Amino acid sequence: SEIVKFNPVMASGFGAYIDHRDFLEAKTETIKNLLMRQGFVVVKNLDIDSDTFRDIYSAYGTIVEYVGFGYRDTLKLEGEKGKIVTGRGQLPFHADGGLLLSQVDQVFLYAAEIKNVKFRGATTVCDHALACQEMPAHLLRVLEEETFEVRVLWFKVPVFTDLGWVRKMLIYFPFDEGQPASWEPRIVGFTDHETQAFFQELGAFLKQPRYYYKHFWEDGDLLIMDNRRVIHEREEFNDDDIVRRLYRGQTAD
Amino acid sequence: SEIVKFNPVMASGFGAYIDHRDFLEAKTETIKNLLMRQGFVVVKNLDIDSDTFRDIYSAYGTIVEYADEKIGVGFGYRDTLKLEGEKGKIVTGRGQLPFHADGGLLLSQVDQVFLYAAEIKNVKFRGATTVCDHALACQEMPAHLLRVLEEETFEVRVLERGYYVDVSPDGWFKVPVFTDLGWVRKMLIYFPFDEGQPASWEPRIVGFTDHETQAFFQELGAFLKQPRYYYKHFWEDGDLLIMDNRRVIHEREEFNDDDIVRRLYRGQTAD
Amino acid sequence: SEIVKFNPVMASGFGAYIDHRDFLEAKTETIKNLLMRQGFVVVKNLDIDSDTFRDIYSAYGTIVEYADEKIGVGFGYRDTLKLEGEKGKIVTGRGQLPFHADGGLLLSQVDQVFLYAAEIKNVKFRGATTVCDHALACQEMPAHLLRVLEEETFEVRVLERGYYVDVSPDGWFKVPVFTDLGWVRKMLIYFPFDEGQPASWEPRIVGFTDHETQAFFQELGAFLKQPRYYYKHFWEDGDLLIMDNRRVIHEREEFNDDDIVRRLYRGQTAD
Amino acid sequence: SEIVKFNPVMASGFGAYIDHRDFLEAKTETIKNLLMRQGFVVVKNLDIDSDTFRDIYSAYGTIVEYADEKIGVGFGYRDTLKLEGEKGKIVTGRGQLPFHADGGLLLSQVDQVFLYAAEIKNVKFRGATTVCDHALACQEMPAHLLRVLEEETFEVRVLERGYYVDVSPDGWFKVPVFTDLGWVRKMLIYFPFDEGQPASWEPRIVGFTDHETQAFFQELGAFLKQPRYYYKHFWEDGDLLIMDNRRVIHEREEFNDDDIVRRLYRGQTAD
Amino acid sequence: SEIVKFNPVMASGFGAYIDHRDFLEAKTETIKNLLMRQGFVVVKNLDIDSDTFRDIYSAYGTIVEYADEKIGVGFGYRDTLKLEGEKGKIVTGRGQLPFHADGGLLLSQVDQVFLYAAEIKNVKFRGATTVCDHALACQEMPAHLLRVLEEETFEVRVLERGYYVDVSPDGWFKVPVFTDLGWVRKMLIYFPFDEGQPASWEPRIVGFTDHETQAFFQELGAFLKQPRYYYKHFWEDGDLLIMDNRRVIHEREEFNDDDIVRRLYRGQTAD
Amino acid sequence: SEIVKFNPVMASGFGAYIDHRDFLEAKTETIKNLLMRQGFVVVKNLDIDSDTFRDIYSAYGTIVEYVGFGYRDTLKLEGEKGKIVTGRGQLPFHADGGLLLSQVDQVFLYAAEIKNVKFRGATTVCDHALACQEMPAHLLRVLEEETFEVRVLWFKVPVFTDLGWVRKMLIYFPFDEGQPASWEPRIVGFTDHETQAFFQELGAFLKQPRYYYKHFWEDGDLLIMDNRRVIHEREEFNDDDIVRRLYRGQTAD
Ligand SMILES: O=C(O)[C@@H]1CC[C@H]2CC(=O)N21
Ligand SMILES: O=C(O)[C@@H]1CC[C@H]2CC(=O)N21
Ligand SMILES: O=C(O)[C@@H]1CC[C@H]2CC(=O)N21
Ligand SMILES: O=C(O)[C@@H]1CC[C@H]2CC(=O)N21
Ligand SMILES: O=C(O)CCC(=O)C(=O)O
Ligand SMILES: O=C(O)CCC(=O)C(=O)O
Ligand SMILES: O=C(O)CCC(=O)C(=O)O
Ligand SMILES: O=C(O)CCC(=O)C(=O)O
Ligand SMILES: O=C(O)CCC(=O)C(=O)O
Ligand SMILES: O=C(O)CCC(=O)C(=O)O
Ligand SMILES: [Fe+2]
Ligand SMILES: [Fe+2]
Ligand SMILES: [Fe+2]
Ligand SMILES: [Fe+2]
Ligand SMILES: [Fe+2]
Ligand SMILES: [Fe+2]
């Protein structure tokens, strides 16, 4: 049972900054373990190609393809115009994957190339377990008792999947007006007014600095998330001068 | 001197969730006492009618009622006010009621306020009754806000003439912000209605311009609405919410959707 | 309803330091009110004699006094007790008085207690009067301690017969730990004297062995003595310490050095 | 996933009080899940015999039991251990069991530990079972204490030969303090017994002197016993305490009074 | 070393309220010292003319003044600047002055800044001078905001040419955000003016777009304005506000109401 | 104005752990600055001889000799039997140096050789500024208003010297019974009983983990303190098997 050197990201003690050399030398298991309780790992100054990226993430478990024969492993998020996920707009709060064979345990994001962007296109991370514990009861009640449905632009998405150590969160926040949308949420028995108001209020609570981390990208950055322990978002970068190229990997057990 | 089981509502330890059986079996004095320090009580799944509701609340003191020459108040409800979201009404209407304490505008002492949900339909995230821990808020408030509350003169004018008849004063009258009862400084304050919400009353601050008064209420409002001090009650059939009117202030949030059914019964007591 | 300037004593906001001019100019009601929520008041550099001391405290309510058939209590002090560190005495002696509330053992209601330092000499770090914020302590206390206080039967027996005469009961008698006044649960508790300190009274807990009772009081004691709840007043000439007897409990620490001069005047009021 | 209603035990939010009816109606998986994050569950007012106790705990996984070859372990209890304060025994005796995790000394994995109060008499403030939130404590621990736990080699020797027979290793053997399970670093540690308490086991730290090890454990113990991390359970008939043995460590405090009746049932499960 | 009596302004312990008599009797060095750790001092009820104001502030070090060659700076004030809300001016105008430190744009070192209220009329909730505890804020700041402050190049351009004449550099020039003095990282930063407010200066960040810079300042401003770091001073006649310009940054909020009289004296000193 | 990478030692944010390479590469001024607000610096794995130790510390200002001609620079604290300061017993809470020309601004301690000790002979550091701010008023009153005198085994030692950014503390706690003592404190107008009780109570408050750091020594450890910002203590190591050899340097401006 080995230890890796890290520093917490949040004041709560959540998250982990790891030096690139310490990360590279650590056993896969050591990082996989730390991620479960720290939620996310931030590594800077990591000069690697796409093949090394795959060598790194594939060791964490079975690759989740984005039938499959193992080829759709690394997703290139390069801000392609006319796309949503691989596009240039917002991705509101969500977790990756779904249930059963489509579940995702770990998500890896690596910055291949970043140019002309300093305060847009952040990837954000929310400590949902701590947030749900400290949340006003009227917000937590909705998450725990009401049926959340989603339509791809209706099916039930169970908000909480109790794994004991965490309640894995699956949720899909609405896109901001003006943003190209791939999904639309609703809450059974709530009006449009009520659902809009709920997501606005919940979104504001989840974005408080105690729970919320904003990662602004630099070449060689690696962001790893335990997809069961955090939820995440991409902020818009809709300027054509911006170059933002990330590689995405996903693993599960 | 007896004890009732309860769970705190607020992270601070303020408020009281009480199981309906525990509430019903408790002596009136036990609940009346707890309210002084806990500010408010929340009971769910209480199955009672209006007569039993009165039996419960009347035991807490002298019923605050408007009869004889005062029969005009609240359109002649006498004791138990029916808040049923009626069109063309404000207090008993479908819009917001901003932060207030009961009784003040009618120059009546109100110690306890009781709200029971007779019927709630097609509303999940509107029409909340909200509760503020003002003692703790005043203790932790930025000095420039507390100063205004402690030192400046607040005046109110009523606007819903059908509700207040001639029991309320005619024009602008002074409402003392704090009344020192020792164990608490009872707060009597009357916030401005949001733009677009029909206004039952209207506040001003002497020596302040309209620009300053608006800015002050909005800033104070945002402070008081922080989760540390602020509880939002979303109504279900059989909910009972009791407030110590000296220890908390409260609001109703708008429910201006025609499909909503929201009928509450309201009782008031004082000593 | 009027305001007195003060600074909190405790980091929690509890307690009140009041400048002597501000205290003297304030109405009795202003101070009486503040005590209910602040628990205690500290005034320094007050230059008064015993007659003026009585003029001040008697305004707070009905003087708790022992005359006629009760003239035996406290060796015939009647109203203002002189605590002057007399040999062969306990309450008015030179040793510890463990955590207690006033009045309880004599079956008298005491709301406010006043202590004025007439003369203090050759003491800088002994002979403190200490004050505990019991409401906050009970709120934050470990459950296994609070349970005992709320559920078990506490009994006391007096030992200083010359002080309590026949006004106190003869043997062991029940003292209710909490009396619910709503705004506070008034605490009546009587801690055991430390080994080596002459004992004016003695507690027991029904159903507990001597081993368990000793362990409980020591553990509770250490909890109550934490800085968050606990204020230590080291006396200087002209100090006035006022306590709301329903809102705090207090102790005196030993001053068993013959060179020490420690003379306090004590008044008590109730409604 | 189903939700069981509970209230936190610790101010931090750790631990779970669950109503006996809510507990009985809950799916095993619901409680088993909750235990991983809450560390321990406290249920009062259960009325169950030894067979029903077994039916409840056995559903949580594979029963940790010692039969056939390992029949000597625990003086032949097999599955449910009866801790009844037997004279001349230690684990099932009347003395202290210092901070520990179950199973480790027998080289058995134990995930959940169950303790039910069959009979308790003449004890109110002794014989407690205590629980430590070790994950929070390690996170907030002074660095000089955590360093020892993370970097030094901890060895243990089994002393109560009748309890551990030949299943436990002979002489000193290394027990790893932390085992990283990702969601938690499982703690395996075996504190030294107080002087005067019969010792079932004995710890040492390689490279440390006897006084360094004694000093370390004394200081670490005091830190872990702070109320932020520490819960004391005083037993009553029908109490059920469940612990996730990976998430908390626990102790028994002595009850060496002849009049005390203290009989607990113990079950253990693992996956 | 002498001690001046004071009360903290912020809940954190930062800032100092000092009684006017205590202030006047205090040695200059005592106040000068206290300011380094308390950031700012607030004195009320001073009755002083402009000459006495100068005598007080000039004792704190070398007067930061602009005479002879630099006589054009501040429209020829020399030592004491009169901020009297003059139309067609900005610094001495009636609008907002956003978060800043004094001196930096003129390339002058300023250690202490003094502000005295000569005359204030018809203003109760506008025209505040505000103070930010930047050391605490930077320590608790979200990492994405602090990174910009520590790593990016901040440039400023002077716009109110009449105020800064030829002493300020022409066009865009780099201003270092942090200057490490050991005891503090002195902050030099110049926030953008709100739209509708006449701008005395203008910031940019090298490599940032206009909307990135605007977005950064909006978010940073909101964080710094949290009551934990932020004090709002609403002026009355005889108020004195002193700031250590190395330890805090400050702003003026608009007072663009014609009826408002707001005349402040300003002094600056450095070593 | 340059920055050095560090991690806080205390949960309050006080103190600084610095990696040995980062420390060696940092400018003297950068460390000297950080020490003023962080109180103390901890560096591990520093393999240097006595001459390099001197090269390092002498750059911080004027060397304070332990008349002088500059030769008594590095004090060797090697646990010599029959000595106090360079002995094997306790040194209770104190700051180094005195006033005027004998003042000490920075104290450096380096572990040349450490053997047979794991839980004795710690050097401890107290955040006195934070402690004085949060202290019960009855404790702070004594420190602020009463005269403290010391006798070498009577002269006034001013408790607080107000430097603005800090109140520099000079104080000399009594030695524990059984420990060889080089000084003895008293408080004017307090009895022996009262003074003993005060130091006991104050000592307990100052040793709470919020304010108090314990450094257990390893070969190559360097502990630097800003002597104006912290007070410190040595815990006994009175076992003859223990090897504890520290080099001490002191600088002032
Ligand atoms: O108590 C009342 O009946 C009325 C309704 C609005 C509330 C506030 C006040 O004075 N009253
Ligand atoms: O109030 C009293 O006179 C007495 C003295 C001790 C105190 C506690 C109590 O019942 N009394
Ligand atoms: O799990 C067990 O049966 C035994 C009893 C003592 C406890 C600690 C340990 O290894 N065991
Ligand atoms: O210090 C000054 O006189 C000028 C006025 C505005 C303030 C900010 C700055 O560089 N100055
Ligand atoms: O582009 C990013 O920052 C993350 C994209 C993402 O969340 C996803 O691919 O699911
Ligand atoms: O309808 C409600 O929520 C409460 C209305 C109210 O506050 C009142 O009756 O004064
Ligand atoms: O002497 C004192 O400090 C107070 C004595 C006391 O508590 C009492 O009079 O009951
Ligand atoms: O008796 C108890 O309180 C629990 C004993 C125990 O921990 C064990 O049997 O291992
Ligand atoms: O008018 C004020 O409030 C202060 C103005 C100011 O900061 C300045 O003159 O630089
Ligand atoms: O030996 C140590 O740990 C420090 C000694 C010390 O404090 C000193 O020399 O002044
Ligand atoms: Fe995603
Ligand atoms: Fe109301
Ligand atoms: Fe008393
Ligand atoms: Fe056990
Ligand atoms: Fe300025
Ligand atoms: Fe030293």
Short mmCIF file of N, CA and C in Angstrom, two decimals, chain C residues 9 17 122-126 227 231-232 234 236 254 257 260, chain F residues 136-139 141-142 146 189-191 193-194 197-198 201:
data_model
loop_
_atom_site.label_atom_id
_atom_site.label_comp_id
_atom_site.label_asym_id
_atom_site.label_seq_id
_atom_site.Cartn_x
_atom_site.Cartn_y
_atom_site.Cartn_z
N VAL C 9 -17.91 40.15 25.86
CA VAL C 9 -16.80 39.63 26.65
C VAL C 9 -16.22 38.38 25.98
N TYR C 17 -19.02 44.09 28.56
CA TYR C 17 -18.20 45.11 29.22
C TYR C 17 -18.94 46.43 29.06
N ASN C 122 -3.33 42.22 47.45
CA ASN C 122 -2.37 41.11 47.41
C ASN C 122 -2.89 39.85 46.72
N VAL C 123 -3.71 40.04 45.70
CA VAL C 123 -4.22 38.93 44.89
C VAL C 123 -4.33 39.35 43.42
N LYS C 124 -3.67 38.59 42.56
CA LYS C 124 -3.65 38.88 41.13
C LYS C 124 -4.10 37.68 40.29
N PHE C 125 -3.84 36.48 40.79
CA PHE C 125 -4.16 35.26 40.04
C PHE C 125 -4.79 34.16 40.90
N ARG C 126 -5.53 34.58 41.92
CA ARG C 126 -6.34 33.68 42.74
C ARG C 126 -7.68 34.36 43.00
N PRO C 227 -12.72 27.82 27.21
CA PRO C 227 -12.77 29.28 26.99
C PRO C 227 -14.00 29.76 26.23
N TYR C 231 -15.78 32.43 31.51
CA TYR C 231 -15.12 33.71 31.79
C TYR C 231 -14.59 33.74 33.22
N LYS C 232 -13.34 34.17 33.38
CA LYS C 232 -12.73 34.29 34.71
C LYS C 232 -12.54 35.76 35.06
N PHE C 234 -10.94 38.32 37.53
CA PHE C 234 -10.00 38.63 38.60
C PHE C 234 -10.26 40.03 39.12
N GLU C 236 -10.62 43.65 41.04
CA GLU C 236 -9.95 44.90 41.40
C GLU C 236 -10.96 45.82 42.10
N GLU C 254 -10.59 29.31 44.91
CA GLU C 254 -9.98 29.48 46.23
C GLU C 254 -9.04 30.70 46.31
N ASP C 257 -4.76 32.22 50.91
CA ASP C 257 -3.49 32.84 51.29
C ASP C 257 -3.86 33.94 52.28
N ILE C 260 -4.03 37.75 51.46
CA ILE C 260 -5.07 38.26 50.57
C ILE C 260 -6.18 39.00 51.32
N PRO F 136 -7.69 33.94 26.16
CA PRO F 136 -8.61 34.54 27.14
C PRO F 136 -8.03 35.84 27.70
N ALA F 137 -8.89 36.84 27.84
CA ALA F 137 -8.48 38.18 28.27
C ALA F 137 -7.66 38.19 29.56
N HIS F 138 -8.02 37.34 30.52
CA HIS F 138 -7.31 37.26 31.80
C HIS F 138 -5.84 36.80 31.65
N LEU F 139 -5.54 36.04 30.60
CA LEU F 139 -4.15 35.70 30.30
C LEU F 139 -3.41 36.83 29.59
N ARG F 141 -4.04 40.01 29.68
CA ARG F 141 -3.89 41.16 30.58
C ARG F 141 -2.57 41.13 31.34
N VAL F 142 -2.20 39.95 31.85
CA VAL F 142 -0.94 39.78 32.58
C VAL F 142 0.26 40.10 31.68
N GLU F 146 1.65 43.52 33.38
CA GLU F 146 2.51 43.18 34.51
C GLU F 146 3.99 43.16 34.13
N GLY F 189 4.75 41.54 41.97
CA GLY F 189 3.47 41.66 42.65
C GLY F 189 2.64 40.39 42.66
N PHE F 190 3.15 39.33 42.03
CA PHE F 190 2.54 38.01 42.06
C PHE F 190 3.30 37.15 43.06
N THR F 191 2.60 36.28 43.77
CA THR F 191 3.25 35.30 44.64
C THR F 191 3.79 34.15 43.80
N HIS F 193 3.07 31.03 44.03
CA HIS F 193 1.89 30.25 43.68
C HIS F 193 1.20 30.80 42.42
N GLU F 194 1.02 32.12 42.38
CA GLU F 194 0.34 32.79 41.27
C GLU F 194 1.13 32.73 39.95
N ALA F 197 1.17 29.14 38.62
CA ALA F 197 -0.13 28.87 38.03
C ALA F 197 -0.32 29.56 36.67
N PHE F 198 0.17 30.80 36.56
CA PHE F 198 0.06 31.57 35.31
C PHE F 198 0.84 30.91 34.17
N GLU F 201 -0.81 27.66 33.02
CA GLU F 201 -2.00 27.90 32.21
C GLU F 201 -1.66 28.49 30.84
#
